[PDB]
Design an enzyme around this catalytic site. Structure first.
Site, PDB file in Angstrom:
ATOM      1  N   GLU B 299       0.767  -1.265   0.000  1.00 31.56           N
ATOM      2  CA  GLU B 299       0.000   0.000   0.000  1.00 31.56           C
ATOM      3  C   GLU B 299       0.824   1.359   0.000  1.00 31.56           C
ATOM      4  O   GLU B 299       0.620   2.188   0.844  1.00 31.56           O
ATOM      5  CB  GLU B 299      -0.944   0.032   1.200  1.00 31.56           C
ATOM      6  CG  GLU B 299      -1.926  -1.134   1.280  1.00 31.56           C
ATOM      7  CD  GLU B 299      -2.799  -1.101   2.548  1.00 31.56           C
ATOM      8  OE1 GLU B 299      -3.813  -1.762   2.536  1.00 31.56           O
ATOM      9  OE2 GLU B 299      -2.463  -0.385   3.560  1.00 31.56           O
ATOM     10  N   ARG B 343       5.625  19.268   7.947  1.00 31.32           N
ATOM     11  CA  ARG B 343       6.320  18.052   8.297  1.00 31.32           C
ATOM     12  C   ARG B 343       7.556  18.289   9.189  1.00 31.32           C
ATOM     13  O   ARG B 343       7.911  17.447  10.002  1.00 31.32           O
ATOM     14  CB  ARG B 343       6.721  17.286   7.035  1.00 31.32           C
ATOM     15  CG  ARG B 343       5.536  16.771   6.363  1.00 31.32           C
ATOM     16  CD  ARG B 343       5.761  15.594   5.475  1.00 31.32           C
ATOM     17  NE  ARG B 343       6.367  14.483   6.167  1.00 31.32           N
ATOM     18  CZ  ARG B 343       7.599  14.066   5.959  1.00 31.32           C
ATOM     19  NH1 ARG B 343       8.412  14.689   5.092  1.00 31.32           N
ATOM     20  NH2 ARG B 343       8.038  13.025   6.628  1.00 31.32           N
ATOM     21  N   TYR B 347       6.963  16.202  12.434  1.00 30.65           N
ATOM     22  CA  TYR B 347       7.669  14.959  12.553  1.00 30.65           C
ATOM     23  C   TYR B 347       9.182  15.101  12.698  1.00 30.65           C
ATOM     24  O   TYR B 347       9.869  14.082  12.946  1.00 30.65           O
ATOM     25  CB  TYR B 347       7.424  14.144  11.336  1.00 30.65           C
ATOM     26  CG  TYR B 347       6.014  13.920  11.098  1.00 30.65           C
ATOM     27  CD1 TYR B 347       5.400  14.458   9.998  1.00 30.65           C
ATOM     28  CD2 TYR B 347       5.254  13.168  11.985  1.00 30.65           C
ATOM     29  CE1 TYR B 347       4.064  14.247   9.768  1.00 30.65           C
ATOM     30  CE2 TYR B 347       3.935  12.958  11.776  1.00 30.65           C
ATOM     31  CZ  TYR B 347       3.338  13.492  10.653  1.00 30.65           C
ATOM     32  OH  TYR B 347       2.030  13.282  10.422  1.00 30.65           O
ATOM     33  N   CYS B 374       3.687  33.832  12.087  1.00 24.87           N
ATOM     34  CA  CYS B 374       4.119  34.442  13.339  1.00 24.87           C
ATOM     35  C   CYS B 374       4.373  33.416  14.442  1.00 24.87           C
ATOM     36  O   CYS B 374       3.843  33.531  15.528  1.00 24.87           O
ATOM     37  CB  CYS B 374       3.129  35.469  13.836  1.00 24.87           C
ATOM     38  SG  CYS B 374       3.295  36.961  12.976  1.00 24.87           S
ATOM     39  N   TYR B 404       2.028  13.915   1.852  1.00 22.47           N
ATOM     40  CA  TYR B 404       1.682  14.503   3.173  1.00 22.47           C
ATOM     41  C   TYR B 404       2.086  15.964   3.329  1.00 22.47           C
ATOM     42  O   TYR B 404       2.530  16.354   4.401  1.00 22.47           O
ATOM     43  CB  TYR B 404       2.339  13.671   4.325  1.00 22.47           C
ATOM     44  CG  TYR B 404       2.000  12.245   4.185  1.00 22.47           C
ATOM     45  CD1 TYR B 404       0.741  11.797   4.480  1.00 22.47           C
ATOM     46  CD2 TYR B 404       2.929  11.331   3.681  1.00 22.47           C
ATOM     47  CE1 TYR B 404       0.399  10.448   4.305  1.00 22.47           C
ATOM     48  CE2 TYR B 404       2.603  10.052   3.497  1.00 22.47           C
ATOM     49  CZ  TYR B 404       1.318   9.603   3.836  1.00 22.47           C
ATOM     50  OH  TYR B 404       1.009   8.323   3.629  1.00 22.47           O
TER      51      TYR B 404
END
Ligand SMILES: *Cc1c(COP(=O)(O)O)cnc(C)c1O
Ligand SMILES: *Cc1c(COP(=O)(O)O)cnc(C)c1O
Ligand SMILES: N[C@@H](CCCC[NH3+])C(=O)O
Ligand SMILES: N[C@@H](CCCC[NH3+])C(=O)O
Lengths: 446, 446
Positions: B299, B343, B347, B374, B404
């Site tokens: 997948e 991201r 992450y 800001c 993503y």
């Protein structure tokens, strides 16, 4: 039973419990609101929002000394509350200034912030007559000068400072060399170089100094140091240019970061006390350097917009997950997720969650409120307790979602934004409707 | 000179340099793309994407064995590409299903995922004739089976397992008790309990088992152990139901998380090699317990949509920040930020970023590509290098933002979603238009 108590420092001012035990905001039961408007739902307690506007303004002498930081949450309705309650409004990009203007916000009560203001943004601002711009670079100062000279006005400005103070909850870190994008260093001379450039031209005019030092602060200690280091620059500038070209720098802007209670144990200082203290340390610090006390300005975002609003969800799935040989964790999946509350995943925030559609007699069990996105990190409340009988159909609310949640909302996994509703003295009203599939496709170009 | 080389494993496959040293995609100079469509801008190398689809398809035997993970990036145009390339499509919520349907993606070829599917979402999916649904709780089983019976069909169904393998890049954690929201634990017997429920219903047919074990995986080791535990569940399933009811469980879906190169140093295995090990891990493990090998399904989301696209920005501000008594960090502030690429903040991701509007001589300097919101954490690239003569009006581009990035896009500080554009062989069309003040206000009521 024990998950029943709704800590008043955490929940909106106007939260009550029904005779049938349904939690109510501003007289309206949350079940009613979920039937009328759907879930997930953002529920704003307007009197709370206004109350905090009014308590802050009183604390600092004038709503003019209080600038609401739009980034926490902004729409027309809110711009209009801010306006009515007499505070200023801090916008940060072209887009924020647009909206504030569309809502007929007095542009003399607007201050414009940003580390990367474009030319069109600086233009559009003097064009509407914003009347403060907090400059952040030599390049922005050059651009603002041209632009303003061209329009035949004198733009009041503040310079943004790095004083190497970073505050959070009950501590703060001080560094020799603050390593971030905003501001100009006081110690390396950059800030004083900027103060000069602004004095060199006639099209700008320096009216104060700005510093923003953190978020979720519960102490005044970091502000005190920060204020010392800022007033220290003030001393330097009257020491090179003498108290005359300098008399007009009468504002010190200590930024925002005034914290709130996400959890019961969170203990931010009442705004009145906090304000009294800051005012004292601004006056002690400026006098102990031979200088008339300047006016104190703060820029609250969260401490105005946060507590008043809650997010209402519907339990959809309840799964018992084994996490040791003996222990479990109750994963309760809800209507939304990191799409409407990324704060947990993004900042490691911690929230309070409560069963609101009824009262349960079942014992507390350890739990995780998670959302419905196809990502294991899509967690709304990492660690909480939940009645053992929690079940699909129940409604829960997460407290203090009024700041930063909706502004950060996304369409992850094509999940539209939740609706937002305001409730006031018995009456609810849609403010921001819920996105639909047509919205999801509206950018698509055939 | 060395900030000049565009690693082939990181940038889109059709990337080149002009005669005047400007970066091009499928033959369009980036700078050209910037003046028509503006920046920030997503440029998709359509042919890299299709190229990625064909290769993966070939490795795992057919497009039927590769389901593309919508959550990575989805719009009608992409739906159409996946469809044309002969792959399947995984959707995760109602909205993801809707868009795919609107793009009339063939429903036999769709598979529905999710940890909290709603009655309406499951209802819509049986109506559309969705074809596979991966079930995640006992509650979903009851709900689904009813919905299939009311519609007069038998819905094929796989069960999501938790096998205690979490994997990332060159290692993986194993656990006795996997503590996350998805799936049904094998070790605890939750998985058997599920397999047993599905066999027992009138209206569901179990046709495989599903496992998803991480992200950015570069080794096959985690998959091996996973498949082992997964096929060990199959071994029990014939130790109860015997082979004749079990030869319908013919698909082992090992999830996604197949990795890609964000930096030059990143060494994900080439897909044809990976598939071939996984194919043999499944056959060795499958006979090791006396079974005929199931077909392998995989997948990918990131491994398809990742590399093909980049994000084009315009440098707006360049500030030189002192991070040491002697060292310096070049803060280069840019056109969008965490709104179009969260991201790094979310992450801790690490991206490549290169000057593309022109070639530079100036020596490389240590830097941080930063955004315009800001918030200090609005950082796109934390630790990179830029030519010392970097200056406003330059164009830089960040590699591998296909996955993503736009999915996670928000309107933080009212910064609208960038435009997305596809480029096929010298031609460039707009796919997703850029948002405007009207979209920003489009949910306001009155
Ligand atoms: C974010 C921000 C604020 C408001 O922050 P809160 O923590 O929400 O009170 C005020 N001033 C500036 C410059 C900011 O960037
Ligand atoms: C995210 C996801 C994938 C694909 O992940 P990538 O890292 O993007 O390849 C596959 N299956 C499921 C169920 C997922 O949630
Ligand atoms: N972490 C991935 C998705 C992994 C899904 C885990 N169930 C991302 O960058 O969005
Ligand atoms: N880390 C902060 C976020 C800051 C928001 C804008 N400066 C928090 O406690 O949520």
């Amino acid at each position: 039973n024990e998950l029943l108590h709704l800590a008043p420092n955490v929940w909106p001012r106007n939260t009550t419990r029904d005779e049938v035990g349904v939690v109510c905001i501003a007289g309206i039961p949350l079940t009613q609101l979920a039937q009328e408007y759907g879930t997930p739902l953002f529920v704003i307690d307007e009197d709370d929002f206004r109350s905090r506007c009014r308590e802050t303004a009183a604390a600092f002498g004038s709503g003019a000394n209080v600038h609401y930081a739009a980034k926490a949450f902004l729409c027309s309705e809110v711009a209009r509350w801010i306006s009515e309650e007499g505070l200023c409004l801090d916008v940060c990009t072209g887009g924020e200034l647009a909206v504030a203007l569309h809502a007929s916000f007095p542009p003399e009560r607007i201050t414009l912030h940003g580390n990367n203001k474009s030319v069109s943004e600086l233009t559009a601002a003097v064009k509407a007559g914003v009347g403060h711009i907090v400059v952040d670079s030599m390049t922005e100062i050059e651009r603002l000068d041209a632009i303003a000279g061209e329009a035949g006005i004198v733009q009041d400005v503040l310079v943004r400072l790095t004083v190497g103070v970073e505050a959070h909850t009950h501590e703060f870190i001080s560094t020799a060399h603050e390593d971030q994008k905003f501001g100009l260093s006081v110690a390396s001379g950059a800030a004083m170089a900027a103060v000069r450039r602004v004095f060199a031209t006639d099209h700008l005019r320096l009216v104060g100094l700005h510093s923003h030092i953190g978020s979720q602060i519960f102490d005044v200690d970091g502000f005190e140091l920060a204020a010392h280091r800022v007033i220290g620059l003030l001393r330097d500038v009257v020491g090179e240019f003498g108290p005359e070209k300098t008399a007009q720098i009468a504002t010190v802007d200590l930024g925002g970061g005034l914290g709130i209670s996400y959890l019961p144990s969170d203990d931010p200082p009442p705004i009145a006390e906090l304000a009294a203290k800051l005012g004292t340390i601004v006056s002690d610090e400026s006098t102990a350097v031979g200088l008339p006390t300047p006016k104190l300005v703060v820029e609250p975002g969260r401490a105005i917009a946060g507590p008043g609003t809650i997010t209402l969800y519907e339990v959809g799935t309840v799964k018992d997950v084994d996490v040791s040989a003996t222990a479990h964790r109750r994963y309760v999946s809800v209507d939304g997720g990191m799409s409407d509350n990324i704060r947990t995943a993004l900042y490691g925030a911690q929230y309070d969650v409560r069963l609101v559609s009824r009262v349960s007699d079942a014992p507390p069990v350890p739990a995780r409120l998670v959302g419905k996105h196809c990502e294991s990190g899509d967690i709304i409340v990492r660690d909480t307790w939940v009645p053992d009988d929690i079940r699909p159909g129940d409604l829960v609310a997460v407290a203090a979602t009024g700041a930063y949640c909706y502004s950060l909302s996304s369409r992850y996994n094509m999940v539209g934004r939740p609706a937002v509703v305001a409730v006031h003295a018995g009456n609810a009203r849609l403010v921001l409707r819920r996105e639909t599939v047509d919205d999801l496709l509206s950018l698509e170009v055939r």
